[PDB]
Amino acid sequence: QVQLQESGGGLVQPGGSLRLSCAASGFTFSNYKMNWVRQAPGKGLEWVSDISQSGASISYTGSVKGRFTISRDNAKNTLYLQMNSLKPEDTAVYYCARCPAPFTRDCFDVTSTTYAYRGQGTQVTVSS
Amino acid sequence: SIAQARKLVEQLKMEANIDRIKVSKAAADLMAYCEAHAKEDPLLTPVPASENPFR
Amino acid sequence: HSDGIFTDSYSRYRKQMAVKKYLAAVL
Amino acid sequence: ECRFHLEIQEEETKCAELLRSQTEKHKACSGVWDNITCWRPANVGETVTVPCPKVFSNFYSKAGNISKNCTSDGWSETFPDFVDACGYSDPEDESKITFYILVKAIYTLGYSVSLMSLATGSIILCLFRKLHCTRNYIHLNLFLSFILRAISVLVKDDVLYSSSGTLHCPDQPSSWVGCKLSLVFLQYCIMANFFWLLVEGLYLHTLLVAMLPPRRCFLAYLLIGWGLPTVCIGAWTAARLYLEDTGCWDTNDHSVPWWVIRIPILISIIVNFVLFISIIRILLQKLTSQYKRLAKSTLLLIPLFGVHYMVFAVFPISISSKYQILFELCLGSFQGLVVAVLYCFLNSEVQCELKRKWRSR
Amino acid sequence: TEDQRNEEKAQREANKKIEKQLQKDKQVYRATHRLLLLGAGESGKNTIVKQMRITSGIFETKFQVDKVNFHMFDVGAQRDERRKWIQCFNDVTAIIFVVASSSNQTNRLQAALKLFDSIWNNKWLRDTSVILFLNKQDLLAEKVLAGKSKIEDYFPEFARYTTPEDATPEPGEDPRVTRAKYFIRDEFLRISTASGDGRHYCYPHFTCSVDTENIRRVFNDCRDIIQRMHLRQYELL
Amino acid sequence: ELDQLRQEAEQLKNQIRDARKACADATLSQITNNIDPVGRIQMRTRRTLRGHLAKIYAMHWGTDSRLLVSASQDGKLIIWDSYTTNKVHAIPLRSSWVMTCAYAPSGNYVACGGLDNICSIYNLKTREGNVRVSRELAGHTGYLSCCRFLDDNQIVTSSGDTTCALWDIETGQQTTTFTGHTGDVMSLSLAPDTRLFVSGACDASAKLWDVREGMCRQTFTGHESDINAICFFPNGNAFATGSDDATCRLFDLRADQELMTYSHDNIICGITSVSFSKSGRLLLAGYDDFNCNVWDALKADRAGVLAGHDNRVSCLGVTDDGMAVATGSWDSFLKIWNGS
C-alpha cells in the first residue's frame, strides 16, 4: 500500500526555521520524482517545489526559491523541506506528493483536489 | 470530511469481518485448475492444423 | 541530352575511321 | 554496327555494275570503276568534272570537285588529289578513340551499379507494406525510370558498338528496324526519367504549398511520368520517318527531330529548377524562424530533382561539348545509385523496418 | 457447399460495400484538422470558443477557414485528473493551450507553467505541437501600469530581466508592459525549448480573447505544423 | 474528532495487514517448484484486420469466438469475421472519442462509450435492416472507460467519475451505483457466474463488488501506480491486474492477498491490457513498449513474446474456446495470433 507520512510543522515565529520530513512506503523511492505542495487557509492547492529521481534536478516556485531547500534520501526513503527565514504568508498545510508513474518526466497530477499518491499533510503556522 | 471518514471506517470494519483461507489452499486450487484443464487449452498445446480454424 | 550527343559523336567518329581506312586502301 | 559506309559502297559499286551492263557503242574513255564514282563513257575532247562523292559529305574540309580529261587511249590520271581536294584533314583524330572508349567505360559502370542499387531498392519499397504511401510510390516510379534508362543505354551500346559477332552487317532491313527501335527505346527512357525527376519536385511542392493535396493527383503524375514522354517520342519517330530516315537513328543531323526531344527536357529542367528554388525558400523560412542544416538539405535534395542538369541547359554550347559529356553522362550515370543510397538505404524509416525484419527472423 | 456459397458471396458483397463506405470516410477524415482546446476556467478559453462559434463530457466546434475544415474539441464534464484522457489527443494537429497572463487566488501562472511542462514532456504528447495563447493582454496592460502587481514578487528573476532584442512591441506601448509580456513568454519558452528535440513545436501568441485574428493564428500555425511534418518525412528537417 | 478517527482507521489497516501476514506462510512460487515449465511459447500471426483509420483503443470477442467488435478513435465500431477477415458491420459513432467496446453474449447488441460520458447500445439484428442506436445510457460525470454486458437487459460500466454503475437498458436508468474508489476506474472484469466483478482504479487499488446488492466486498492494494487492466482467472477464484509500475499481479479472493508478481528488470513500461488463457496457465499482457508478452501464471517467468505491432498495444482478448488471441494497437491494426 502506497503511503506518505509527513512530520514536522507546528507554530514558529516569523523569520524562523522549520523542518518538514516525509517518510514514504509502498513504492520504490528511487525511480519516482517527488515534490512539495501546500494549501493556504481559504485558498487552493499550489505547488511549492520538486526534486527528480536522483535529486540532481530541483525546482521551486518563485515566491519560495532562495529560502526553502529540498533533498531526498533514497537510503532512508525520505524527502525533506528546509524552511528557514519564514514569512507570515507561508502559513499553510503542506503535503508531500508523489509522481503518478515511475521513469517519467511529465508527471501531470500533483495539486488536485482528490489526488491519491499524496500525504495527509502537516500544518505550518507563523504568527506573533 | 466526517462522512467520507466514517464511510471508510465502516468499509474497513466490513473488510475485517471476513473469512480466512490459507494461501497454500488457494495455490493448490490454482494449480489443480491449471492441470485439470491443461489438455483443453489450445494456446498451451497447439491444436493440429486439421481442426485449427485460423489456418 | 548527353547520351544522344555521345552516341552521335561516337557514330560519326566510327564512320570517320571506316572512311579513312577505305581511302588509305584505295589510295 | 556503324558499317553503313560498306553498304553504301556496295550500292555505289552496283551503280557502276548495272549502268554499264549494256554495250551499244564503245567510247574513247569507257566507263570504269575507279575514284569511287559511277563514271559515264565520254568521247574525245571532253572534260568530266564531278563533285566529290556525297557519301563523304560529312568528311570534307572544302567543297571541291574532281576533274578528268578524256583521251583516245583513256583516262590517264586525276589532276586534283583526293586528299588535297576533299580529304579527311584530321591528323589528330587517331588519339580521340581512347577518350570515347574511356567515357564508354565510365558511365557504363555507373549505369551498372545504379541498376544493381535501384532494382534492390525497388523490392524494399515493394516487399514491405508499411512503405505504401504516395511518396514511396513516386519514389518507386522514379527508380523504375532510372532502371529503364540504364537498360536502354546498355542495349543501345550492345546494338551499335558490339564486337562479339563477325561485323558482317547484312543489308536486310530487320536489323535496321531493330536498331531504330533500340534508339526509340533510349529516347523514351531518357525523357521518362527527366519527367519523373520533374514529378518528384511537383509532388514535394504540392505537399509544401497546398494545405490539402488533390485526391487524384498521383494518377496525373503517372501520365506526366509515362504518358507524356510517349506522345513526344511518337512525334520524334514521325520526324525520323519523314525528315531524316538516313540510317539507324543514332545521328542527329536535321534540327527538327533534335528539337522535338530537346524542348521537353529543357522545359522540365527549368521548371524543376524553379520548384527547387521555391522549396529552398520555404526551408530557409522555416529554419530561420542554423545554416549547416540548410546546406545539408540542399545537397540532399539536389540528386532527387536532377538540378545539376541546369548547369549545361542554360550555358551556351561553346566548350566543344566534351565537358558537358564528361560531367553529365559520366558523373550522372551514378545519379541512380546516389538517389537509391539517399532515399532507400540511409532513409531512417526503411532502415528501422529492415532492422525489425532482421531481428524478427 | 451448395448452402454456403450464397452466404459467402453475400459476405463478400457486404464487405465490399463496407470498404467503399470506409474509403469515403477515410477521404473525409484525412481532410480535417482536429484541435484540442485546453486551459483553465479563469482564462479566456470560453470567450475564445464563443467568438469562434460566431452535461456532456466533450464539446465540439466545426469551423472552416479557406475551405479547410477545423474540428476543435473542448473538455466538458471531466475531473481535474487529466492523466488518462489526455492520451486520447496524441494524434491531434495541435493543442491550443490558453493561459491567463495574470499572477488573486494564488500563482495561477505557475500552475499553468507546470501544466505546460507536463503536456510538453508526456511520452504520448511528445509529437503533438502546442499553440500557446498568452491570453488577457489588456489585464497585463492595465495591471502593471496600476502601480503595483504580483509579478515582480512571485517571479524573483523578473527584476534582472531585459526586453529581448527581437521583441516587436505594439506601437504606443509602455516598455514595462512589453517587458512583462516577453518575460512570461520567455518563461514558457524556457521549458518549451529545453526538450523540443525537433519532434514538436510551440507557437506562442499574445491574444486578448476578443478579436478576429485568433482563428487566423490557429490556421497559420496548423499550416506550419503540417509543412514541418511533410519536411520531416523527407528528412529535410 | 478527525484525528482520533484517522488514528483508529490506521489501526484497522494494521489489523488487516496483520491478518494478511498470518495468511501468508507459503508462497505460490515455492508450491509451484514441483511443476514443469511450459517451455517457449511460439505464436504466429494468422490474420491482420485492416480498415480502421485512427488508433484502435478497445476490442471484444463474441461468444461464438468468430465475430469480434473493435472501436477506433476516428469514430468507427467495426464488427469483423476473424475466420474470413470480412467486415460484417461498420457502425459510425456519434462521438469520435470512444474508449470501450462490449459485445452482448447473445450477440444481438454492441456497446460503446468514451469521453462523451454516454454508453451507447446498438441493436445488431436490424429488424428494419440497419443498425441503430437502441439506447443511450446517461448519468456518468467522468468518461466511460469500460463496459460489459451482464445480459441483453443489463450492463455494468466503469467511469472516470470514480464510479461503476449497473444499468437497465429497458428503462435506461442506473439500477445501482458502486462507489468507494479514489481515482479514475480504468477497467472492470465480470466473474464467470456474473455475480461479482472487479475494478481497477487510478488509486492503485483493485476492488471486488457484488452486483445484485451493490457494495464493496474486498479491496486489494499491492500495486504502486494506477491500474490499467484487470481480468478474472477462469474459475473465478483469482484475478490478474496490470499497472503503470511495469508489473502484473495475481490476487486470490479467498486468501484476500496478492499471490504472485510478474515483472522483469528490462521492462520499465506500463501494462495496458491483461488476459488469461483458457486454462489460466498463460497470462498474456499487452505493453506500451509496442509488443505483448506471455507469462505463465504459476512460475512467473516469461514464456513468449507477441511482437508484431508498430505502436503500443491497447487491447487484448482471448476467445471463449481459447483458439486465438486478438491484439489491437495504436497503429490502427488488429492481429490474430495462434499457436504453431
Residues B9, B40: Cα–Cα separation, whole Å: 45
Question: Is the Cβ–Cβ distance between F52 and F70 less than 8 Å?
Answer: yes
Experimental method: cryo-EM
Nearest to F86 among E11, E56, E85 (CB): E11
Contacting residues of D for C16, CB less than 8 Å apart = 59, 88, 90, 93
**Minimum Cα–Cα distance from E203: chain D residue:** D289
Q: Which residue has the cell 457484488?
A: F210
**Minimum Cα–Cα distance from F35: chain B residue:** B31
CATH code where residue F3 lies: 2.130.10.10
Residues F84, D135: Cα–Cα separation, whole Å: 32
Question: Going by C-beta distance under 8 Å and a sequence separation of 6 or more, which residues neighbour residue A97?
Answer: A4, A34, A35, A36, A37, A110, A111, A115, A117, A118, A119
Q: Which residues of D touch E (CB under 8 A)?
A: 135, 204, 207-208, 211-212, 215, 282-283, 286, 293, 297, 300-301, 347-348
Nearest to A47 among E79, E111, E122 (CB): E111
User: Any CB–CB contact under 8 A between B49 and chain F?
Assistant: no
CB–CB of D208 and E223 under 8 A? no
DSSP state of E87: G
Question: Is the Cβ–Cβ distance between D74 and D28 less than 8 Å?
Answer: yes
Strands E32-39 and D65-69: unpaired
User: Any CB–CB contact under 8 A between F200 and chain A?
Assistant: no
Question: Is the Cβ–Cβ distance between E184 and E109 less than 8 Å?
Answer: yes
| Sign of the dihedral defined by the CA atoms of residues D145, D151, D157, D160, in that order | negative
Cell of D34: 575507279
Strands F292-296 and A68-73: unpaired
DSSP state of F310: S
DSSP-based helix, strand, coil % in chain B, nearest 5: 55, 0, 45
Q: Write the CA distances from F211 to E175, F175, F182, integer angstroms.
A: 66, 10, 20
Helical H segments across chain F, by residue range = 2-23, 28-31
- Which residues are bridge partners to F119 per DSSP? F113, F137
CB–CB of F281 and B34 under 8 A? yes
Residues B9, F184: Cα–Cα separation, whole Å: 21
CB–CB of D282 and E227 under 8 A? yes
CB–CB of E236 and D347 under 8 A? no
Question: Is the Cβ–Cβ distance between E107 and E49 less than 8 Å?
Answer: no
Among candidates E47, E52, E50, E94, which has minimal Cα distance to E208? E47
Nearest to D5 among C1, C3, C18 (CB): C18
Structural domains in chain D plus CATH codes: 3-86 (4.10.1240.10), 95-360 (1.20.1070.10)
Query: What is the three-class DSSP state of E16?
Result: helix
- Which residues are bridge partners to F250 per DSSP? F240, F260
Stated as kind and residue range, the H or E segment containing F139 is none
Question: Identity (one letter) of the amino acid at E10?
Answer: A
Q: Which residue has the cell 478497445?
A: F58
Question: Is the Cβ–Cβ distance between D201 and E220 less than 8 Å?
Answer: no
Relative orientation angle of helices E108-120 and E175-192, to the nearest 10 degrees: 30
Which chains neighbour C (Cβ–Cβ under 8 Å, 3 or more pairs)?
Answer: D
Cell of E162: 531585459
Question: Is the Cβ–Cβ distance between F313 and F291 less than 8 Å?
Answer: yes
CATH code where residue A27 lies: 2.60.40.10
Residues F336, F317: Cα–Cα separation, whole Å: 10
Question: Going by C-beta distance under 8 Å and a sequence separation of 6 or more, which residues neighbour residue A59?
Answer: A49, A50
Q: Which residue has the cell 495591471?
A: E143
Chain center to CA of D159: 13
Among candidates F48, F333, D190, D361, which has minimal Cα distance to B54? F48
Question: Identity (one letter) of the amino acid at F210?
Answer: D
**Minimum Cα–Cα distance from E18: chain F residue:** F90
Measured in angstroms, the CA of E77 and the nearest CA of chain D are apart by 34
DSSP state of F72: E
Among candidates D296, D279, D348, which has minimal Cα distance to D131? D348
The range of the structural domain enclosing residue A71 comes to 3-126
Resolution (A): 2.7
Cell of F94: 456519434
Among candidates F154, F123, F149, which has minimal Cα distance to F60? F149
What is the residue-wise DSSP string for F232-273? E-TTSSEEEEEETTS-EEEEETTTTEEEEEE--TT--S-EEE
Contacting residues of C for D194, CB less than 8 Å apart = 1
User: Any CB–CB contact under 8 A between F214 and chain B?
Assistant: no
Residues D122, E42: Cα–Cα separation, whole Å: 57
In this structure, what is the dihedral angle of CA atoms F330, F331, F336, F340, given to the nearest 10 degrees?
-110
DSSP-based helix, strand, coil % in chain E, nearest 5: 45, 20, 40
For the stretch D327-332, contacts whose Cβ atoms lie closer than 8 Å and that sit 24 or more positions apart, written own/partner, are D328/C1, D328/C2, D329/C2, D329/C3, D329/C6, D329/D103, D329/D107, D330/D103, D330/D106, D330/D107, D330/D110, D331/D110, D332/C2, D332/D110, D332/D306, D332/D308
Q: Half-sphere exposure of F75 toward its Cβ, with a 13 Å CA cutoff?
A: 12
Residue D254, Cβ density class (10 Å: 0-12 exposed, 13-18 middle, ≥19 buried)? middle
**Minimum Cα–Cα distance from E92: chain F residue:** F54
User: Any CB–CB contact under 8 A between A1 and chain F?
Assistant: yes
User: Any CB–CB contact under 8 A between D190 and chain C?
Assistant: yes
Q: Where are the beta strands (DSSP E) in E49-206?
A: 58-65, 68-75, 94-100, 129-135, 202-206
CB–CB of C10 and D161 under 8 A? yes
Residues F125, E227: Cα–Cα separation, whole Å: 46
Question: Identity (one letter) of the amino acid at E208?
Answer: C
- The number of folded domains in chain F is 1
CB–CB of B44 and F235 under 8 A? no
For chain F, the C-alpha Rg in angstroms (whole number) is 20
Cell of D221: 503524375
- Which residues are bridge partners to F149 per DSSP? F155
What does the H/E/C string look like for chain D? CCCHHHHHHHHHHHHHHHHCCCCCCCCCECCCCCCCCCCCCECCCCEEEEECCHHHHHHCCCCCEEEEECCCCCCCCCCCCHHHHHCCCCCCHHHHHHHHHHHHHHHHHHHHHHHHHHHHHHHHHHHCHHHCCHHHHHHHHHHHHHHHHHHHHHHHHHHHCCCCCCCCCCCCHHHHHHHHHHHHHHHHHHHHHHHHHHHHHHHHHHHHHCCCCCCCCHHHHHHHHHHHHHHHHHHHHHHHHHCCCCCCCCCCCCHHHHHHHHHHHHHHHHHHHHHHHHHHHHHHHHHHCCCHHHHHHHHHHHHHHCHHHHHHHHCCCCCCCHHHHHHHHHHHCCHHHHHHHHHHHCCHHHHHHHHHHHHHC
CB–CB of B23 and F35 under 8 A? no
Question: Is the Cβ–Cβ distance between F136 and F120 less than 8 Å?
Answer: yes
